[PDB]
Write a protein that holds these residues in place. Structure first.
Motif, short mmCIF file in Angstrom:
data_model
loop_
_atom_site.label_atom_id
_atom_site.label_comp_id
_atom_site.label_asym_id
_atom_site.label_seq_id
_atom_site.Cartn_x
_atom_site.Cartn_y
_atom_site.Cartn_z
N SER B 129 34.11 24.13 -0.68
CA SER B 129 33.79 22.71 -0.72
C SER B 129 35.11 22.00 -0.49
CB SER B 129 33.35 22.34 -2.12
OG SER B 129 34.44 22.55 -3.00
N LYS B 194 25.65 20.81 -0.09
CA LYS B 194 24.19 20.84 -0.22
C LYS B 194 23.68 22.11 0.44
CE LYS B 194 20.44 21.13 -1.76
NZ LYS B 194 19.10 21.15 -1.11
N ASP B 196 21.22 25.67 0.66
CA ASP B 196 19.79 25.95 0.56
C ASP B 196 19.61 26.66 -0.79
OD1 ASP B 196 19.43 26.75 4.03
OD2 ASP B 196 19.11 24.87 2.86
N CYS B 266 23.68 27.87 3.37
CA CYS B 266 23.00 26.80 4.08
C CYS B 266 22.63 27.38 5.42
CB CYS B 266 23.87 25.56 4.27
SG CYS B 266 22.98 24.27 5.18
#
Ligand SMILES: Nc1ncnc2c1ncn2[C@@H]1O[C@H](COP(=O)(O)OP(=O)(O)OP(=O)(O)O)[C@@H](O)[C@H]1O
Ligand SMILES: Nc1ncnc2c1ncn2[C@@H]1O[C@H](COP(=O)(O)OP(=O)(O)OP(=O)(O)O)[C@@H](O)[C@H]1O
Ligand SMILES: [Cl-]
Ligand SMILES: [Cl-]
Ligand SMILES: [Mg+2]
Ligand SMILES: [Mg+2]
Ligand SMILES: [Mg+2]
Ligand SMILES: [Mg+2]
Ligand SMILES: [Mg+2]
Ligand code: NA
Ligand code: NA
Lengths: 386, 387
Positions: B129, B194, B196, B266
């Motif tokens: 991140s 964000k 999955d 993701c």
């Protein structure tokens, strides 16, 4: 079913009477449920003691000694690991409110061959080898003549093949008797010629009688060397084996796992003997099932339903049984005894003076043949020194 | 590899630094090999102590205290269960010849977010991140300003979510900064990913190389995992990428052992989050799902033995038993309704509780991961925790 927290006032206490490798796994399974464990044996630092909350050393055949430890520890359950224990006291204690696993009667019947053999053959009418008991050399000779050759003589109270002789002719009579005396009363059994032998691990629980897949094994000097699961058997033989096992366990009584020894002759099955507890050959279940025979025994005696047992495919066990004298045993070459689909267990036994089971190798494969080789090979790789 | 017999002169000695439920299973695995176990914690009757040969109660953050116990026990292996230990002393002891699992450096880097994060993102060039470190509200206030909303703020020496705050708004900052002081005076401000779903990739570094367990998915709540399952469904590309990341991280940290690599997925993209240089709580599913549990794997690895392979037994799940009450004599009723076919439960032996605490875990297998999760959840929910 209500369980307390070990060491707290409401703790559920389990006393193990015999702290060998079999008791050790029962201790680990009790510990996994926060059950308080007190390990008892006839020598210090016995395997189950390593993983127990508290340990005591006494003469397990001494009823008075048994009563003292039980009064001191106030266990909710007493779980014996061997046949040679003060069964009359167990009966007393049970009457006084102690839960003896699976039940005191089951322990009384199986501590000597006479109790169990006569029950099976005479009362339950199960198929067994022919047999005759003898309490004198002379009566011993009369029994052999009646049973015929070959036959096997065994002390009425013994295990691991101790004091037994496979009698082929009258020449061995004298030595067989001596040797058996070294292990009073004896059993003289006719030789069953089976295609193979099995151990049918049978669990009697609140939700009924359950069976693990049949376990086959190889004996050497009447002691187990290798075991495997599943052992191939016909549908008819399996069914007859299960009927026999179900009868034996219910007759003996109480919840727990029993190791039913059977001989298989094509589709026919013959009863041999039974451990009213986990069986040595059942160690294969440490790798071959979701719930080991140990976990199953604990589950059943606590009053919990078994539900079902998962078998993961072909597997085998091979004992680590060295011969030496030492009080400081070491195991080398361990890097060559474990790996893919291969494990070992080292018991923690404090010493050895001759031959003693110090560990076990475990493996899985696509066939029992391959699993057996893998396990034997691994056990042999271990370099035992002392 | 040469192993002695526990309690005997040539015994092989393992000292566990932290005796919780994870340490409890490592102890069991050691005991299965006749390895001598010394369980250490900051309170008496911790779970691993129940199954150890002996134990000691000390302040693990006190280096002198640590040296004293170590010196007293002369262990051949020092195995930490948690981050909260005097790692500096671990370094020294390692320098003096002690075997710290996986290695002392590995523990040091991961006990401080600044170490591992810089290593991964900078040194390793891995996807993480966005983030920023700060030493003052100014810098904090500043940083959150650089990251944007929403964002997470964590102490640099935080776990189980302690001292963290998810920030969507400026009003929080009063709190945020102060909280980052509650627990643990430095921090990290991370961007919000964000994904999955999240996974834990249980990666074992051993003599025969690095092997992976099938990916473990999970559900976290109030900084505690609730349920975990295996294998988590993801694309081969994604899995491939995850393993790459894991390998790179474990090898960089060094030493033999089982590592819990936390990642976000993701689509076919994987983002590194952090890693435990030891077994991870979500991996408790491996107690039913594999031939070798994460605990068994850790021990196999640290003892210098080969892993070879890891067998996975189909859809499996774990669901914690996490009550909230105050008692020093907990009992568990209705257990008969929490066990059965393809279903087991573990009760840890914790001596007391005073608030929210993990007291056991339910384990299940089924034909689908979904079914496994439900079976486990239902079982955990049937246990009646009394005080
Ligand atoms: N009547 C019999 N016919 C053929 N083989 C037999 C007979 N009795 C025993 N055996 C063989 O000898 C082995 C050991 O016998 P047995 O189990 O009765 O001895 P033990 O001393 O009670 O051993 P343990 O209690 O450790 O199983 C058997 O597993 C089997 O291979
Ligand atoms: N950047 C991020 N984006 C999205 N979710 C995050 C982020 N950082 C943390 N989380 C969520 O919070 C959980 C805890 O975060 P993190 O692992 O960093 O905290 P921790 O205090 O170090 O806890 P622990 O060491 O016990 O895992 C993660 O499992 C994840 O679900
Ligand atoms: Cl016995
Ligand atoms: Cl007779
Ligand atoms: Mg016998
Ligand atoms: Mg035997
Ligand atoms: Mg036998
Ligand atoms: Mg963390
Ligand atoms: Mg985390
Ligand atoms: Na103990
Ligand atoms: Na009973």
């Amino acid at each position: 079913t209500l369980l307390g927290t070990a060491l707290r006032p409401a703790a559920t206490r389990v006393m193990l009477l015999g702290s060998g490798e079999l008791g050790k796994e029962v201790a680990i399974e009790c510990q996994r449920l926060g059950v308080e464990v007190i390990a008892v044996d006839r020598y210090a630092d016995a395997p189950a003691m390593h993983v127990a909350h508290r340990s005591h050393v006494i003469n397990m055949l001494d009823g008075d000694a048994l009563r003292r430890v039980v009064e001191l520890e106030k266990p909710h359950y007493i779980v014996p690991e061997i046949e040679a224990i003060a069964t009359d006291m167990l009966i007393q204690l049970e009457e006084e409110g102690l839960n003896v696993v699976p039940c005191a009667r089951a322990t009384k019947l199986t501590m000597n061959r006479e109790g169990i053999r006569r029950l099976a053959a005479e009362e339950l009418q199960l198929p067994t080898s022919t047999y005759r008991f003898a309490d004198s050399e002379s009566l011993f000779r009369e029994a052999v003549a009646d049973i015929g050759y070959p036959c096997i003589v065994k002390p009425v109270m013994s295990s691991s093949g101790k004091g037994q002789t496979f009698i082929r002719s009258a020449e061995q009579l004298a030595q067989a008797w001596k040797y058996a005396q070294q292990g009073g009363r004896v059993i003289v059994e006719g030789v069953v010629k089976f295609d193979f032998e099995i151990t049918l691990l049978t669990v009697s629980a609140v939700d009924g009688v359950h069976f693990c897949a049949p376990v086959g094994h190889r004996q050497e000097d009447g002691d187990y060397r290798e075991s495997w699961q599943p052992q191939q058997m016909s549908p008819l033989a399996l069914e007859r084996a299960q009927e026999i096992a179900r009868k034996v366990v219910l007759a003996l009584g109480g919840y727990g796992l029993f190791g039913v020894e059977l001989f298989v002759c094509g589709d026919e099955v013959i009863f041999s003997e039974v451990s009213p507890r986990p069986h040595d050959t059942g160690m294969v279940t440490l790798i071959s099932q979701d719930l080991s025979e140990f976990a199953l025994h604990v589950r059943a005696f606590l009053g919990l339903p078994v539900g079902g047992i998962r078998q993961y495919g072909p597997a085998a066990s091979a004992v680590i049984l060295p011969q030496l004298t030492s009080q400081n045993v070491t195991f080398d070459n361990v890097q060559n005894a474990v790996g893919a689909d291969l494990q070992i267990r080292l018991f923690g036994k404090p010493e050895i003076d001759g031959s003693r089971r110090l560990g076990v190798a475990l493996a899985t494969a696509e066939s029992v043949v391959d699993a057996i080789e893998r396990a034997k090979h691994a056990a042999g790789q271990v370099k035992v020194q002392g």
